[PDB]
Structures are given as C-alpha cells and as structure tokens.
Design a binder for this molecule. Sequence first.
Ligand SMILES: O=C(NC1CC1)c1cccc(NC(=O)c2ccc(=O)n(Cc3ccccc3)n2)c1
Lengths: 229, 234, 202, 271, 229, 214, 232, 226
Amino acid sequence: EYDRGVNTFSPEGRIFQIEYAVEAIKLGSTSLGIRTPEGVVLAAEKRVPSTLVVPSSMSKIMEVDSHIAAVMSGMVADARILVEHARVESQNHRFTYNEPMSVESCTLATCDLSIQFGLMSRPFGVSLLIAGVDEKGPQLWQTDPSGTHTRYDAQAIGGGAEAAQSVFTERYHRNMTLEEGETLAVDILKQVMEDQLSPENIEVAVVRADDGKLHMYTPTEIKAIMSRM
Amino acid sequence: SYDRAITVFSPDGHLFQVEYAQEAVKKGLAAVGVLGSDSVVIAVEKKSAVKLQDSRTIRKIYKVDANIYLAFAGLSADARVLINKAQLECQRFSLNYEDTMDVDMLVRYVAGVQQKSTQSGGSRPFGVATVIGGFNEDGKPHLWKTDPSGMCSAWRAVAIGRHDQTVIEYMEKSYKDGMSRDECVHFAIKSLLEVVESGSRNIELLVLQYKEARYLTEEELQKFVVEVEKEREE
Amino acid sequence: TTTLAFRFNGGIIVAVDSRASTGQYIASQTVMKVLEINDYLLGTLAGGAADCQYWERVLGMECRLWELRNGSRITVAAASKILANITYAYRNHGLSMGTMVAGWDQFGPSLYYVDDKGSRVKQDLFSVGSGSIYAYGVLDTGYRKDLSVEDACDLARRSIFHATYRDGASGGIVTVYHVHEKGWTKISRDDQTKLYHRYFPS
Amino acid sequence: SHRYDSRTTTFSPEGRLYQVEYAVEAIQQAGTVIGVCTKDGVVLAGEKMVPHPLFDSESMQDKNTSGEKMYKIAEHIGCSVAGVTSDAYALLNYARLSALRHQYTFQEPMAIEDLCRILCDEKQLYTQYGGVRPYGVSFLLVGWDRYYGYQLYSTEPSGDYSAWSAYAIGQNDQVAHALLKKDWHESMTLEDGMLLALRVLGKTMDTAKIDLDRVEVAVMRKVPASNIDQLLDPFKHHPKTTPRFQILTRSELKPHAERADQAREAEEKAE
Amino acid sequence: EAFYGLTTFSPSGKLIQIEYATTAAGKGTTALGVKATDGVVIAAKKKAPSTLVDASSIQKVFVLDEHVGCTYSGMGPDCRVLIDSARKNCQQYKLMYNEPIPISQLVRKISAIYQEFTQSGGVRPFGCSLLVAGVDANGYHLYQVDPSGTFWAWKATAIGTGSPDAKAFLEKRYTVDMELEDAVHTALLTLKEGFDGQMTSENTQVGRVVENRFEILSVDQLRDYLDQI
Amino acid sequence: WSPYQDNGGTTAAIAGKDFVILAGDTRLNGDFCLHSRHDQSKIFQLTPYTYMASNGMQADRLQLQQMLKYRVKWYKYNNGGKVPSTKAIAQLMSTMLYHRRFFPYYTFNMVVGLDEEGHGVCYSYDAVGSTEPFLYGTRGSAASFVEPLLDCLINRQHMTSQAPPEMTKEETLAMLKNAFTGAAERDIYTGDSVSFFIITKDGVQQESFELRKD
Amino acid sequence: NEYDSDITTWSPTGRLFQIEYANEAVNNGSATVGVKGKNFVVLAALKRSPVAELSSYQEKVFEIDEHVGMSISGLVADGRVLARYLRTECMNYRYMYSNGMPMNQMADMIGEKHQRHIQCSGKRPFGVGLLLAGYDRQGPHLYQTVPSGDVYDYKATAMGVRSQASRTYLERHFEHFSDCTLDELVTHALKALASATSEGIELNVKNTTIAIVGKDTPFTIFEEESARKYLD
Amino acid sequence: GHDQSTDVFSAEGRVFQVEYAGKAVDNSSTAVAACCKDGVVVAVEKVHTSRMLEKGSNNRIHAVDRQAGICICGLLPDGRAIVSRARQEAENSRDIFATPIRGSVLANRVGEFMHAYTTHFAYRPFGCSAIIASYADDGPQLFVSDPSGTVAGYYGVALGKAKTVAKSELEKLDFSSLTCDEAVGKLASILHEVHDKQKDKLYEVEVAWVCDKSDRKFVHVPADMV
Ligand SMILES: O=C(NC1CC1)c1cccc(NC(=O)c2ccc(=O)n(Cc3ccccc3)n2)c1
C-alpha cells in the first residue's frame, strides 16, 4: 500500500489517494442538502454507535457562520479540520471586508486546504455540503477530497447518496417551499438509514432566505416535520 | 526532516494506520466512565499486582487540570505524551483566557492532536483512546471519549480498551440517568467486572464531583466488589 | 476623548463623547467610541483610534470564533484577557489604546480596563481619556451602587458632559449605553451643547 | 529512495510496533541487571561480559561515576543499562544534561520520576516521529528524592516506564523476576538487598559461587554530608544526609558475594 | 534528502547493518596496539596495492593531537571522516579547557559519532575500527572503537584481518611489567607473524606514545627497530 | 534622506441622497517647486461605484491604489464576479493601512461611493485607518479651510433660519467649486484645477474646473 | 509495468508514464473548444447538463486578466491552482509594466510551471489541460497546454471527451476563421463543441459557456442574456 | 530494481535512467547543425500532430543570449527548462562578469546542469539534448549536451530519429569551406531527405543561425532561404 506514492496518477488519470478518499465517503453516514428559494436544508443521519452517546456531541452539522452551515460525511475528525478553517476564513472575511462571506467564497477556501497533500500526508476523507444564504440567495455546494467544489440544488453524500439521488431526480423541483424541502429531506433519510428514523437519530438545519440565518432543528421541531408524513 | 506519508488511504476507503492504532487500543486495558447526576466515575483495569511493583500508589487515571481527569487505553507511552500535551494545553488556556478550560474544549484539543497525527507526514497515529471526565466551572459534569482517528463524542457511560464493545453493550442495557455517587461507583465496578477477572487489586477507580476528585482506597473499593460480585450470581 | 463606565446594581453604563482631535484641529465631532463587539460586549475606544478600532475588531472576531468553536459566549474576563494579551505582546510597539470591556456573562456584569501595555484591571468604575480627570469629579461624587437606571445614565451623561465642557479634546455628542442581562441597549445620544442648556437653563 | 524505507515508525496489523518489539529482543540478549529497592538504599547488580585478560581499566580518577554496567546520572541518580551499549551512552548523556538543567532552573535535585519521564519521552519520540530506529536500551534508574525516597524505575524502548521494588532487565529477566517475587519484602536492610541482588544474579547466570570478575554492584544510599560550607551561603539549608551513588570495588563486594555463597550453600542443605 | 534510517532492528534483535559494518571493519589490514608501563605503541601494515604507489603518502597511523594517535582498520576513507572529527574535538577541547583532551573523553566523542551513523537517517554506519592511543593525566591508554560505537580499553589488541591470531599471540607475549622498547619489539613481532613477505620501514607504520607525546616513527627510527627483529 | 515627501493638494467629497461628489486638485508639488499642474493621481476608481482619493505622498498613493486594485480583483474572482461594495472596500482599506502601522503609507485617504440603498457615502481615513462614514469630507492642505465651510453650509448648526432643502447634485457641485475656489486663493499648495467626479448609479460624470494658477 | 508509479522514472522506451496518465485526466474532462479569428478568440466549454430539474455549476472557464482567460479540462482543482498562478503572474506583470502580460510570455510561463512538476519526486503533473485565449499587441492568441508542459499555439482546437470529433469539425472550417466575424467564430465554436455532445443532447444556455476576448473586448464570460443570442 | 533511479549504477557502471532518457531524445524529431567559419546554423524538424497549429508553435530553437542559442531535441518542456538555465547563465555572465558568456563556457554550464539531474534519487534526467550555438569571443561554436550532461563540440551534428542518416549526409559537407548561407540550404535540405512522410505527415523545418551576416546575433533565419 506504500507501493504507489500518494501523488500518483492511475492509468485512467485519477489520483489514487483521491479515489480512495472518495471510497471512504461512501462508508460515511448519509447527509443531504436541498436548495429552495425560501432557504436551504441540511439533514444528516447521526449514526450513533450506542444509546449511551450524547447525541448533540456527534454533530454532523456545523455553524460556519450565522448564515452558513456545513454537514460532513466520512471521517468526522477530518471534517472538524475543514470546518475550523471555514470558520476562520469566514471570520477573516468579515474582519477584512465587514460583510458576510459568500457561500461560494467559503467553499473555495475550504477546498483551498484540501489541495494541500504530499504538508498533509493524505487527503481529507470528507465531503462537505455547505449551505448558506448571501446576496445571491440560498446556495448549496459540495466539497470533495479532490478539492473540487460544485454548486448543487440538491445533493447527498454518504452510503445513502445513490438511493438519495434516485429520489431527488423524481421529487425535487427548483421551486419547492422550505417545508416541502424539510419533508423531502427527512423522507430520504427514513428510506436510506439503517436504523429507524427518530428525532434524535437525525440532525436537520436550515438557512432561511428571509432572515439569512441558520436554525438548527431541536428534536422537537424535527418531530414537527415527521408529524406531516 | 522525515515527512513520508505514513497514514494513507488504501483502496476500500480505509486508513490502515488508524485501523491498526485502533487495534492497539483493543489490546489495552479496559477503562470505563460513568456519568451520574453530580458525579463522574472513571474506572480502569490495572495489569494485576505483582509483588514487585511499587506499593506506593501509582495512578492510572491522570489529572489533566484541577477539574479534568483522563484514563486511557493503548500504548502507555503515546498516552503519556498526549496527556502531557493536554496538561500543557489547559495551562496555556488558563494563561490566555484566565478562565479554566471547559472539559469539552480540552477534549477537542486532544482529539485534534489525535487527528493531526493521522495526517502528518513522518508520524504514525497515537495508538490511544481516552476517556475524559470532569466538571465545567458551572457544576455540569461531562464524559468524553477520543479514539485514534481523532473522533470524540460525549457519553453517559463508556468503555475503552479490551472488550470495549462487550462492556458498552452491557452498559446500554442497565444504565439509568440520574444515578447517585454510590450507584455510579457500583455501576462502573459492575461494568468493568464484565471483562476483568477479580475486583481485588486490578481496578483503580476515581470519583469526580464538582471541585472534588477522590480515588477509592483499596478498602472502600472492596465493599463495592463484594456488594457487586454477590449481585452477579443472580 | 472622555469615556467612562461603571457597574451598578442595574448593570453597566458606558458613556462617551465623540470628538477626535488631531492635536488642535478637530477631525470629527462624530466618532463612535463605543465599539459593539459581540451583542453582550462593548468596548470603548480611547487613545489611537485605529489601534482601538483594529484590535477591538479582532477581539470581536476572537469572541465570535470562541462562540462557534465552543457553542457558548465568551466570558468578559476571557475577552478582556484576549485583548490584554495582545496589547501585552505589543507593549513595545507603541500602541495607544485605553479600552474598557464591559459585558454581562453568566457571572453577571463585568468591567475591565485594558491599556496598550497589557494592563487589565477590573474595577466597578472607570473613566478614560484626556477628559477623565474631569469626569471622575462628577462621577465620583454621584456614584452609588443603588442608582436606578435613569439615575445611572443621568450620572453618566452628566459626567461626560462636564468633561466635554472643560476639556478641549472632548466634545460633541454624549452617547450612553447600558449593559444588562439581555445584552446592551444604546440609551441615548445628545449633543453636549443641548445638554448644557438642559442642565443649566439660564 | 522511498522504495527502500523500512517504515520504522509504522504500526503493524495488530497495532504492534515491530521495531520496538525487536529492540526488546535486543535487550533480552544483554547482560542481566538486577535492582532491589530497600529503605536503606537501592542496589544494582549487573552481569559484566567475560573479562578477557587483556582488558585494561580506563584508570578514571572518580571510581563511582561509571563502570561497565552502572552510570551516575547525578549525585542522586544512578542507572544501569541493558541493550545496545552505544544507544545507552547517547541517552545517558541526555539524562545527565536533563538532570542538570533541572538543577540549573530550580537549584534543587530533579526527582527520579521526572528524570525518568524525560528519558522515556526521548525514547517514545523515536517510535512515532522521524523514520529512524528506536533506542535499543532499557534502563534501571535508581535514586533518592525527598518526594518518594529510594526509587527504582525501569524503562523500555517503547518509552514506557514503571516503578518497582525490585526488578531485572536483560538476559533472564523472567527468571529473575520470579526469584525476586519470592524473596523480596518491604523491610530489608541494605545488606539484605545486596544479598538478594546477588543470590538472584548468581542464580540467573547459573554459577555455584558469584564470579566477582563478571559482576558489578552499585548502591544508591544516603550518607552523612561532609561539605556543608555554611559561612558561604548562610541562609541555605544543607541536609545532614545526602544521596551517594557508589560503585563497589572488587574488595568492597567480596564480603557480600561470600555472604551469598553461604546462603546458596545453606539452601542446598534442605534439599 | 533521504531521511529514513538504514540501520534497523531485525526480528532477533540484531542491528544487521552494524554487523556488516563490523565485518567490513575486520577486512582491513592488521593494526595493533600495545600498552606498556611507560607508553603505548600502535603499528599497522601498509600493504600498498603496487610498488608504484608512493608509500610515503599512505598513512595508516595518525596524529590526532600532540598526545594521542590512532590507527584503524577497515575502510580507509570512512576512518578519514572519524579522524578529521577527532582532530577537531581535540582542538575544541584545548580551546575550551586549555589542556589536552583526555583519551577517555576523545573516545567517547568518537563513539558518539559512530553511534549517530547507526541511528540517524540516510546514512550507513562506518565500516572501520580505530585504535586510539594516548597519554593524559590518568596515564597511558589504548582503546578500540568499533562501528557499533562501542569501545574498550585494552592492554593490547589487534583489529583487521589477521586479528584473532594476532590477539592470541599478544596474549602469550604480553606482560604487565613490559617497557616500551619491548612493547615495540612485541608489536612488530606480532605483525611479522601474519605478514606475507618481508617487513620494511616502507610497508609498516608505527606510532608511539612516550613521555607526554604521540609520534609516528620516522623510517630511520623504524628501521632501527626492524633490524632487531 | 526621508522616504516621505508631501506632494500636497486637497481632496473633498460630498455625499448626497443618490450621488456622491468627489474632488481633487491636480497640482503635484515637489520641494519648493511644482512638478505638474495636471496630476490625476489623487483619485482612483476602484469599482464603478467606489473611488478613493488620497493626499500626502504621491508615491504612496500610487502604491496603495495598486494594492487595493488587486485586492479588489482578488475579491471579484473569489466571489464569482461581484464587486465589493463601498462599505467593503472601506473596511478593506482600513485594514491595509493598519497592516502598515509600522512603516505607514503617507496617504490621507477617502473612500467614496454608494451604499447598498444607493445613498452616497464617504469614509475618511487617517494614516493607519481610523475611519468613519460621513456625508462629507476633505483631506489635504486646504482641508482645514474647506471642512469648516462645508460644516457651515451643509449642517448650519449656528443658523436660526430653517435648513434649506436637500442639496441636489448641481447645487452640491457648485458648493465644492466655490470652496475649492476659495482654497486655491489662500492655500499656496492647492491650485491649478479640480477634477470632479459625480458618482451616481447611472455612472460617473467627470468635470474639470479651472483654479487660479499662482 | 514497473515504471509507471513515479514521475521521476523513465521507462526503457523513453516514456514517462505518469505524464501519459496525467494526460488521461485531460482526455476525460468535459469538452472545450477554442477558435481564433482575426481579432477575437472564442472559448466554448460544455458544462454538465441538468439531472432533471437538478443543476450543478462548476467553474470551467476563468478570466485571468482583462485581456486573457482560459478554459480547463481535467482535474478542476489543478485548474484552480493554475488559474491562481496565472492570475497572480498577470497582476504582478500589470503592476510592474502597467500593461497586460503578453500572451507569448504567459504561455512560456504556464509551460515552465508545468515542467517544474514533472521532474522531481513528490511533485506531480497537473492533470489539467488549458485553453488560454487572450489578446495583446500581437493580436489574438489561443494556446492549449497539457500536463507534459507543452504549449501549443493554435488557430483552433478542442480538448476533453469526444473532442476528437470537435477537432474533425474544426479541421474542415479552420482556414476561414481569419476572415470570419465574431458571430461566425462563435457559431463555428458552438458547432464544433456540439460535435462532442453525447448522442441526443444538444447545446443550450445551461450546459454551455462561451467566452470571447479580442480587440477592444476584454475577456468576457457570457451569461444567460448574451449567450441565448448565440445559441439559437 | 537496478534501473528505477538515476542515483544508481548497474553492475556494469551504467546508469540506466540516463540511457532511457537518451532514448527519449532518439525517438524525437531530428535536428542538425553545422559550425562554419562565419557562424553556426542549426535546423530542426518540428513534427506537428495537428493541421491547425500556428506557424511558430513549439519552437525548438531558443535564443539564450544575443550571441547564443539552444536548439532542443527531445522533450520540449524539459528543454525549455534548460533554456531557462542557459539564460540565467548568460545573464550572470553579463551581470557579474560584464562579458558575453563564451560558448564553451555556456555549454559546460548547460552540461553541469543536466548532469546534476543524473545524480540524485529525487530528480530524473532530462529527456532532451541541447544543441548550443554561440558566436562570442571564442568564435563560432557548436556544442551538444546530452541527458547524461556529456558535452561535446562539433563541426556538424545530428540528433533524433534520423540521426544516423543525417550524419551520413552531413559527412558529405566540407566544413572548412562551408558558409552560413550555403548551410541553411544544406541543413534544411538534409532534414527534408531524412524526414519520413507516411509517419509524420505534418512538419515544418525551423532554422536559426548566428553568424557574421546576422551581426553575430542568434536569430531564426528569414523564411525566404528555405
Ligand atoms: O486617551 C489616551 N491617550 C490620548 C491620545 C489620546 C489614552 C491612551 C491609553 C490609555 C489611556 N488611559 C487613561 O486616560 C486613563 C485615565 C484614567 C483612568 O482612570 N484610566 C483607567 C485606568 C485604570 C487602571 C489603571 C490605569 C488606568 N485610564 C488614555
């Protein structure tokens, strides 16, 4: 496994450690993101290893800034690193330009840390989704271990992703409400999760277009979503 | 400087060096943490008690700051390094922010050092899991775990080391919220004895209450081992 | 510049004038000299305006990253300590800052002074700036813990006014903020010359 | 060049570190050292290698600072090593500086357990960073500090260390442990410990008598303090006793080795 | 730029590169040393590949400082590294303490360089042993340093090719009473034992420590000793 | 040998409700002499809606201007094409002045433009970045003449007479001509001409205006 | 293949497989075309086309300075590195000389940057192809670059997937491009770009970018208003 | 495992990674050059893969100083690296020594630089031979530095795939008498004969000289002489 150095291309023009880091993101818990004109929604399977875990502590959704959230899949500890950098970058942007960082600019600056490997032994085994609201309204991007951001309208990452890109293709239209989005989110998780979907087993957040602020759904408010289905 | 890449993804997404660090933690002595209403209980297996080791008390639960305590499983010497770093971090923090470090802050620092070592060229991962327990300066008790991937997580109770998952499966069944000090110590002793042989000289046990950390004397412990081994017949 | 703040039972009042002198010519009658860092923390600007504006802005950024990193607002003691460690690190680089950091953390209201040398002092009452020598006279005499919140703002406003009236470098608009459990409010702005006519109505 | 890297600081599949396991093998090949921690002092008895008749002494002026197995780290700290001798000297020099830096900074003796942690941190490093091989060395440290009294630690190449009442490193350490288990107790004089150290050492290297030529003994004990120069700092307190590391000459050791032949003759009567 | 180690432990606990360096260091030609009550003699074969080599230019015995000398076996140029360093150390010590470096300290310094090349990255160990002979306040000395970095004080010894047999023959003829005239005689006799062909003041070199100084015998002085054997 | 030289002249801006007017005089002075009566270096467009003006050392405003121009290009690229707002550039400039704290640019800058709501604004700086928004502004050699006059005619705090209407952009411009004109008369380092830039949403008019040459 | 694992290893036939493999990265990126008229250069890049009602931007095309910009294919993250590099070198140049960096000099540079990454251990080739289009005193330019560090000065070209067909198309028509107008250059680009679409997909404003640059025309990526004009 | 790094000798004291880089040069397009009494001419066959290149594309001939040039044979990118180093040497000679670099010196410097990359496990040899053509104070000079860094002066020289034939044709020329005017004709003619048509269908022949007529400046020759 040290036969091929880490900067090596395969015969198909893929860097091997990147392709492998991607393979690690398919072992991760499913996360997903849905752009709506009313806001963005992120939702994550928590996938806790025990009832004895305190579920707030296994937080797959993270405030980057008042208006940006991220949700990881793959190696959580690797994700903590990226999100720390995003936080720092988003805040340096406020500092320097006295305004909130755009969501894309933020995703860029999080990919700017993922290029660095030869410095970092290996790539981050992490894909983020980064939802936010700025001047161009709600937005959802995906980072990969490649370092390649990609704006999306709906996305999944994780073991779910393939089954969840089935469901988006059928039920996602560019014009849904924030509640129809919450609903499609939680639906998808119900369908792809291993465990029974309960209000502690998942994590849901939204960044609303109107206020441009990010709300993390408490278990209560996630029941309020499960209610109508 | 030597900066070869030690930790790298293999084909099926895995980081072997981190899986193998974790294998080194499954060979380590058990440790267990339990969170009650007003207490955290950290209990660890000792290796035995050969007549040769110093009869002067050596603790296998380490103090990181006044308020924070850490058990570990895995490579002793790696652990010792992590702990020294943790100790030194808590002081750096006091010194920068006057306040004392919240436990969760300390845990995150440690987990970040663990993570950092799965991604630094030249270095292998620490082969150490930790249980960390303590109280913030607001009377709220916490209990955390780190594994060698650098992942931490808060628990109501937890086990690390050999047969961690046997012990955690046990604890899922029994464990209730809002235990007393004495029910915590009981529950921890009970849980450890799922994998440790006697409860004689091979269990150190630490009890953390807001502002007061106290190891059981070998005598106080044995009233609890009889009270428990007598409850295991049934 | 004249700034003051004090703790009383109701919280903390903070008050400031708005003049920025370039020695003898007045560059601005309208500087805002209370920086709203967080929304539980204020800081004042005295000294080098840039120095205070810059490092208070940094403090605001450190406060906010704390909150993101740790899920909980930074305490005042920490905030002041962050700023004090910066000014200490730069004690040899001739910063000019005299700053107050006021807020209400989970330990109640707290008020610190932090200067350019890294001093960090925590008293119940402070004034800072060319005109402090005046404001303390009016303030030291009227200050009591049991002030209401009108009486405390009145006291604070008058002390700034008295500083403005006498001290060439202080002037303009007296701004008063209150810092209470739910954050801070800006209580009032008044031209110091309207205040002359209110306090002395001949 | 990376094709030829042997990847010394990697884990193996069972979370084993092979270079550290094999350093340990190197140590189990080395001359045995026994340590016995009494309450009147600590004793180190070590197997020297077989003395070719052409070996010379280095004729050092200070007889107690070093021998073949035993070295002084500081007035209050001695050690003995098993394993790759040259690695030992690298570390020994490091331990010497550390103890004296501690004394520089605090002007008091470094405690044994801190010297020991320092040493083993230096070893742990080489098992994690740096892509080179570990130090293939095991100390027994001994010494005396005001915190814990006579102590005796032992280190391993992993960087772990442990406190003991008695212990052995080197050749037949498993065998020597089993024999100290049986005969160590908490209330030994120095003479008793010196005996126990030799009975065990002579039992591990399979000799009828102890072979004075093949054995070194060092003792760490407190002795009256001589050079209380009290007019020179009036406020300084000088303890009545101070630790001394002592390596026994062949003559000082002769009695104690006879006295351990006599308790090897009087243990083959019962049989 | 190679920073990984070349010398490593092997499953039996051996450091094989160091055994091989030790093998290399016993493939030199014979050098030997004899300590006596009033001095030390070291002596080596200079077996020149051809007669067309200017034997004056081959140095097998070396001054390190006024009071101390060495000779060596195994790989010449590796030894040249050690000698250069040892010369520096002798001089650094004088600069500091304004006394001559005691042989014990010198050899520990050499030992240390050897040890670094058994652990440091990128390097192989030295494939040569030294004898070092000198005089300090503790008297006359003679040390052997091997590539492990180990060293031994000796009363007499021999490194290089004919060495087991040369050591055996020194065991007989050595006496603790020996004076230096007899030591030289013994050293030269011991060389001559395993010497293919006539010994000459060309194909042998000899160093002596006498009184307070080390000197390499001239060809004149060596010819007077070789007329008595 | 100083690394600093004052090249003189004067900038002034006045904000309006949907415009801002910015002016600098075109004299570039040396020591005891005059290098150019036609220097346009004081005013520098950063984006269509944001300009900077600088007084002090012509060399340092050229450097500064370029440093900002490139931070603004980076910003454009890192933010999918959009230009930073006047308020963002204003804060950016404060931060860049301050990063040189130690060997400062010898510029007295203004950043002017349109806020988001489309209202004019001016930020004035000291040499290390103390700023604040204002409705008007003047730095330079004539500042201490002009600034009190603008105080008087805009704010009118010592006039009983009720404040006249909001000043249109033609009236505002006249006002700055009148005040540049008086300054050229009395400050010996201001003269020659004034470049005016009227920034609105619809673009930027330029207008040159002759001052007295002596 | 014992020789294909390291950029520092020649094969016995004198090949550098890691560089041939980096080329594969480029042959497998989304197609892009450029063409060069008398006064203008047109880049057209296929993007990724909606998955039902479900889009997906990636920045293929980058402005680099007023007078130049580029289109990439292959490993987008390498694109960005190169884009950052070119942008920065163009600002340094424009800072120093107050004019745009001339294209032949910028092509020399982008090619030297690549070479720096195909000769030492632990660097690797860029896995990205560039079309660089720009306009200077010498007129319009269009360069293709490749992982190997080569830089071709083209009249027209395409690269990426199925871009062989784009090249067949361009080979028929390219001799005319020096006389064509900007609208026919753009037509010709789009036509060529479309010979590279999969089966029954067609070009439209949401799977196609167009950039132009040229005389009195700073480099301009086309948005949905101006693009529509050309795509019908 | 004897042949993976240039830091290694084979058992016969060969360095294979250099021989291999060598093969890169031999499988490349052909160059020739001739050193007359009035100057140096170097010509090289550029093989295009596309019909749509600009004339000028992939110049293999670079000026390195006023009086010197390098024609690369083999991997063009590797050569542009050498060309950059040659240019730095030429600049150094002018900046420090206030003299144009003599051609033997320039070629030695080029050789040293190429050789350096044959000694260290971390770099590979260059896959290009540089032909250096100078006309400084040392007179007309033509050297070739190959990937091993070996440097040799020539009267005439041929590299690349048709090298064996092109040398046979270059032997027919009289170097003592031949002038830069004639040589542009001959050397170009030679590259047309040895060019293989059914393999490499698209090709121009780039020519450059440095000579007394060019005011001892190294320049592409005007495309009237070809
Ligand atoms: O305004 C300043 N400088 C000039 C350039 C503008 C300026 C610049 C730096 C600091 C200050 N401080 C003060 O003026 C001041 C005056 C009185 C007073 O009580 N305090 C609070 C305090 C509390 C404890 C210890 C020391 C001070 N502070 C001003």
